[PDB]
Each structure stands twice: as C-alpha cells, then as structure tokens.
C-alpha cells in the first residue's frame, strides 16, 4: 500500500519549515557522528596536506518527522534531503572537498518511527596538515580532521561521537606508501570564536615514516665514503696517482649520493637534518682533499713535515668525524 | 513557539523586494567588514599570486527585516540568504575563488531585532600579487587583497572596517615555510572608474623570505667550489692534465649550481642577487683557468715568471674573493 506511505510522507512535509532547527528555542539538538574511512590516498609534504575518502553519517532526532502505523525504517530518495533541516557541519582544516555524484549524488536519508533521522554522505576531502621536517626522515607526524558547526553555537547544537571510540572504523585497513599509521584518537570539545562557542570534534592520526630504506640509502653510503676518504692518509705520497684516484672516487660518490637524495626528497624549500649531515660529510671529504694537496705541495722539500702531518691527520680525522656525528646525534636524534 | 517564529519570518519576507537595496533612493547603506584569516596556503612566484582562505563577515542594517516580540537573535539556515539582499562585494585582484560547500554551503545568516544583518562566508581566493625579484633571495614582498563594490557607487553604499585596526584577526595563524609575516595594514579609500566612484578596502601583508635554505643550497656550495678551484695554484705546472681537469670541473660545476631552484621561477628579464653571486663566482673560476693557461703558455721560456705568477695568484685570488663577498653582503644586507 504505497498510497498510505505517500500520504504519511506528504503529511510529514506539509507545513515543515527548513529554516528552523528541531526544538527551535528549546534545548539543543544533539548530533552523533560516524566516519568510515574508505582510504587515505596520498600524504603530501610539498603541499602540507593529505587526501581522505570517507562515509560520513550524522544521527539526530526531529519530532516533526515522527510517523506511526508504518513499522519500517523509511529509506527515502536522497533528494528528500533538500526538503529537510540538516546540520551545517563543515571541516575546519580542509582545502577542497566534494560529495561524489555518480551515478546520483551519494547521499542517504533514513527516517525512523520515533522521528530519528540518519543522514549519510560520501566525501573526498583534501585536508591541511602542517609537518615538522626538521628531524627528517625520523620525523613523526600528527594529521587531524576537524569537524565543526558553521552557524549554530553550543546553545543550539551539540556534537558527540556515536559509539564512543568505535565511531571511526577502517583505519586499520589503510596502507600508505611512505607512512604507517600508529594510533588514531577522537576528541570532543568546544571552541570559542568572537561570535560564540561552537562544538568541535577532532579525528587525529599519528604517522611514523618508514625509515629502513633511507638509512640504507643515504646515511650508510655517506659514512662509508667518509671512512674511505681516510685510507689515503696511510698511502705513501710517492704514488700520488692512487691518492688522486681515491679523492676523485670519493667526490664522485658524494655527488651521486647528493643527486639521488635531491631526487628522493620533496622540493620543500626549507632546511632538514639530512641536508646538514650530507653537507658535513662533503666538507669532511673536501678537507681531506685539501690536506692531500698541502702534503703534495710540502713533501718535496720537507719530507719530515709531510710525514708528520699525514701521521697526525690519521688520528685527528676520525676523532673529528666522531665528534661531529655525536653532535648531530644529540642535536637531531 | 516554532509556529510563531515561522509566521514572524514569513511576514518579514512577505513583500520583500530583493531587487532593491536597503534605503533605496535615499542615503547610502553602511557595510562593515571583518576578516578572519585561516591560512595562506601558498605563495607562487611562477604564477605570481598567493592562495588565501578566510572568514569574510559583512554587517549592515535593513529596516525591512526588523521584527518585534522576540528577544532573540535569529540564526537562520543559510538557504534563507538566497532570499535576502546582500552586498555585491567582489575582490578586484582575484583569479579563482569559491565558497566551500561540504557538507553544506559554508554560509551564515544572523538577524537581530533592530533589523541588523550579519552575513558570513568561508572563501578561498587565489589573489594576484606582482613581485619584484631583483633582490631574490633576500627580497621582501607586499601582497594585497582589494575589496570593492561592483554595482553600487559611494552614493549607494559605504565600506568600513568594523573595529578599526582590530577588524582583521588570525594573522598569527599564517605559517609559510619560505616567508614570514612582518606587518599587515588596513586601507580605506575611493576608486573612480568611468561609471562612478566606488568604496574600496585593502588588506596588505609584508613578507620576508627566509635565507637559510639558500645559504645551505647555493652560497655554501659556490664558496666551496671557488675555494677548491684555488688548489690549482699549489700544483706544479708540469702536471698539465691535473690542473686543466680541475679548472674545467670547477667551471662546469659552477655553471650548474641553482638549476634545481631556477625551474620554479618566472622568465623575468632582470638579474637577481643570486644570479649576480653565481656570475661573480663563475668569473673567479674562469679567471683561475685563464691564469693557468697563461702560465702554461709562458712556462718553457721563462719559468721564473711562471713561478712568480703562481705565487702572486695564491695571495691575490682569496683576497679578491673576500673583498667581493664583503661588497656583496654589505650591498644586499
């Protein structure tokens, strides 16, 4: 008997005012939020943001939409959402968001006999997430999604997570290329602007970057090259060709490491720890080359001086390199 | 009572002519602006603009919307904004702007018993900002946002900042990885076009570019390469291949220093500071190579002159490079 349902729905929407929230002027209307994360697409250090797709469900109660005699969850067409009051929920820290619209607008309206309304959307949002890259690539990031009411204050609307810590699901299934999600957290609070106090929900993920490949790629080769640069100290100065070959090899390897690192790193124009470490290693090999040049210039007239400076360099280069590594470890690790 | 409020609003909107501004045919309507800056997402030199996200609030008074009997301020659903009169405010120097629309259109309408209307939007705008890069990377930019009325002259509308110097807030939320906010300024004036005089507001920021990245990436490598090019003067001139290879390597490496960062700049016709420093270093290394070529040319006939030239170069080159650095860093800092 679709005629009875049609009559009931027409009666519900007859005289309905979409400009007035439920219980207008009375106690605030409570909205419960559920989020199902379909996927986190990409995390960008260049743009300081991340893209995230989700099913976003809001649950509330409107006494105007109460019907009796129909023992069913009335699942209506999504266009009915244009004839009802819905919360003005928005994401505070987003840059570009949209609701999917193929094949129709991705939206669900479900009414319940007591007047309860369930309103679901499928949203893909790019959200800002400032990152601290000083300790790159040991950095650990914390990216948030902020949910807030735009127009209504805490005197009119209230937010809460439906089901508590079970409100957000599907985080465990997310796989990212660079990062691995460690822990997510849900927070509910109030935020005061000059226009008043608004409810606020926060969903935050803590991301730890994968570190093995970088360590095997940029730190170990640099350390090995700096160690190899000291072999020429033990080489006697009679065979200058071997020392020239060693210097050329070390410089070529350092340049190759630097170019590959430039290729790997995002092009964010600000300082990072790995850049300083590579610069220090290059300065060390450059100093070794200059010391060899000084030995070559001196050895012909004063062989004792050249032997002495080589012998002293043999002990003062590893000590200085170890001191630099200790300073780097304390300052950035 | 919800029905009483609904009938009050219906009576307010009955006979309301949207096509006519408040006080049509009479004194101009005064509109006050507030801006709350959320973030400046990016500042592009290539495209010569900057992206800015803000809360834009407009405050005015319409006697047609005055209501009595309700000691409340009516926060209405944003859709009612489609049925009221709002100022035709536009931004003169914006290239692509939009109002965020997830989950609903980020718009706010609030009415007061006096008839005063508060209208709020959340807007992301990409505003053009022409830049003078003659002192790059030690430059300092000044980016403005211009706010104007399109269809209404100073006889129909007036603009002012609500709160004076406190009209714009949230400047401390701006976090540019490459710049730093130095000062923000508010201006109010009139602009005369062929169709009349229009009110104009202006919000201007002054940006100071960070230097550490360029010191680590450009200046230090250039100085190191220039210093390494001086090792040629401490090598016996009989080793022609070694000195020639060192000179050629230094010249070619100096020609290819800022290639990575010179592909994110516009094709400007003038010389920046970094270009001048690189050209100076190139001149130094080229002169070192020419000095060796001359020494090799006069090596056989008069070895004493060649030795004297090398000895004098050993002192002249570092001193002149130090003087060049002194003059450069005094002029540009």
């Amino acid at each position, epitope marked *: 008997n679709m005629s009875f349902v049609k009559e009931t729905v027409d009666k519900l929407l007859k005289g309905y005012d979409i400009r007035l929230r439920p219980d207008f002027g009375g106690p605030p209307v409570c909205v419960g939020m559920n989020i199902d994360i379909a996927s986190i697409d990409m995390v960008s250090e260049v743009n300081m943001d991340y893209t995230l797709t989700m099913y976003f469900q809001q649950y509330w109660r409107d006494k105007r939409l109460a019907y009796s005699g129909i023992p069913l969850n009335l699942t209506l067409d999504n266009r009915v959402a244009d004839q009802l009051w819905v919360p003005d929920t928005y994401f505070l820290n987003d840059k570009k968001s949209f609701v999917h619209g193929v094949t129709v607008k991705n939206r669900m309206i479900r009414l319940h006999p007591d007047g309860t309304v369930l309103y679901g959307l499928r949203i893909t949002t790019t959200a800002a997430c400032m990152m601290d890259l000083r300790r790159y690539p040991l950095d650990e990031q914390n990216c948030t999604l902020e949910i807030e009411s735009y127009g209504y204050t805490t005197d009119d609307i209230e937010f809460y997570w439906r089901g508590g810590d079970k409100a957000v699901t599907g985080v465990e299934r997310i796989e990212l290329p660079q990062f691995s999600i460690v822990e997510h957290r849900l927070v509910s609070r109030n935020v*005061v602007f000059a226009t008043g106090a608004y409810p606020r929900l926060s969903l935050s993920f803590r991301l730890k970057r994968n570190i093995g490949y970088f360590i095997l790629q940029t730190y170990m080769p640099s350390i090995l090259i700096t160690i190899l640069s000291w072999v020429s100290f033990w080489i006697n100065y009679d065979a200058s060709a071997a020392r020239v070959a060693l210097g050329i090899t070390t410089v070529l390897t350092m340049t190759t490491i630097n170019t590959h690192l430039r290729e790997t790193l995002p092009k964010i124009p600000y300082v990072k720890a790995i850049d300083m470490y590579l610069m220090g290693c290059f300065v060390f090999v450059f100093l070794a080359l200059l010391e060899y040049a000084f030995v070559n210039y001196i050895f012909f007239s004063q062989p004792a001086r050249a032997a002495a400076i080589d012998r002293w360099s043999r002990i003062v280069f590893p000590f200085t390199f170890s001191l630099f590594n200790l300073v780097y470890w304390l300052y950035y690790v | 009572n919800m029905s009483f409020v609904k009938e009050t609003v219906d009576k307010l909107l009955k006979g309301y002519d949207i096509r006519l501004r408040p006080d049509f045919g009479g004194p101009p309507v005064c509109v006050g602006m507030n801006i709350d800056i959320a973030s400046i997402d990016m500042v592009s030199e290539v495209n010569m603009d900057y992206t800015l996200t803000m809360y834009f609030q407009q405050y005015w008074r319409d006697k047609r919307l005055a209501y009595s009997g309700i000691p409340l301020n009516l926060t209405l659903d944003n859709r009612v904004a489609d049925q009221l009169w709002v100022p035709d405010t536009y931004f003169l120097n914006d290239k692509k702007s939009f109002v965020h629309g997830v989950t609903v259109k980020n718009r706010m309408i609030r009415l007061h018993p006096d008839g005063t209307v508060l209208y709020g939007l959340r807007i992301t705008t990409t505003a053009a900002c022409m830049m003078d890069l003659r002192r790059y990377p030690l430059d300092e930019q000044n980016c403005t946002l211009e706010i104007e009325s399109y269809g209404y002259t100073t006889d129909d509308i007036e603009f002012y900042w609500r709160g004076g110097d406190k009209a714009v807030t949230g400047v401390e939320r701006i976090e540019l990885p490459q710049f*730093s906010i130095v000062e923000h300024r508010l201006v109010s004036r009139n602009v005369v076009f062929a169709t009349g005089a229009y009110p104009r507001l202006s919000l201007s920021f002054r940006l100071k570019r960070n230097i550490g990245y360029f010191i680590l990436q450009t200046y230090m490598p250039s100085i190191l390469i220039t210093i390494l090019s001086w090792v040629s003067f401490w090598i016996n001139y009989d080793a022609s291949a070694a000195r020639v290879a060192l000179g050629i390597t230094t010249v070619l490496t100096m020609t290819t220093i800022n290639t990575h960062l010179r592909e994110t700049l516009p094709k400007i016709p003038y010389v920046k500071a970094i270009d001048m420093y690189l050209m100076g270093c190139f001149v130094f290394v080229f002169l070192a190579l020419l000095e060796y070529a001359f020494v090799n040319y006069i090596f056989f006939s008069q070895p004493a002159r060649a030795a004297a030239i090398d000895r004098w170069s050993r002192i002249v080159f570092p001193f002149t490079f130090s003087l060049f650095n002194l003059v450069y860093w005094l002029y540009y800092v």
Partner: nanobody
Amino acid sequence: LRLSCAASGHTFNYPIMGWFRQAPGKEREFVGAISWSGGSTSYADSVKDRFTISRDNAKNTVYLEMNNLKPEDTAVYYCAAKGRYSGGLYYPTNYDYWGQGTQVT
C-alpha cells in the same frame, strides 16, 4: 621586569603561546600572544607600548618584558599553550596547557 616561559615536549602541535593574568576579584584576562616560529606578536589594548613579547627557538623560550608598571597590575600570571585550530586568541578556554601561577605586584 621580565618573565620567561620555557616549553618542553610537543611544542610544534601548539605553535602559539599566550599570557593571562587573573585579578583577585575578577576573571582571567588576556595579555599577549606570540607565534612560536613566525615571531608575530599580539597585545591587549591595555598593555600596548608598555609590555613587549619576543621568542627564541634556540632553547624554546618566550619572553614577556614589563615596562612602566602601574599599581593596578596586581594579578596572578599564567603562561599557556594553544593548539593550531583552537579558535580565538583572547579566550582562556582555547588554551590547553597552563604554566605555573606567578604572583607579581
């Protein structure tokens, strides 16, 4: 005089430091705020040109210097940290971590 607020821990997630003072018979009042990194300061109208605020990230410290003090400045001071999306700057509610209460006459 001069007061120093030193912060330790996850100071990146709270890039704004603020100063508040509570009168013996009144509520907490905003004084000043400073970005941790940007070095931009905001002051209340009652203490403009008399107080100054600076910051140094070498040891994660922020300095509030008081000049031309007046007897009506007898309040207990507090240094607080504010999140990146905590909202307004002049409201004590938005600040999460509060420093030690300091009494200055």
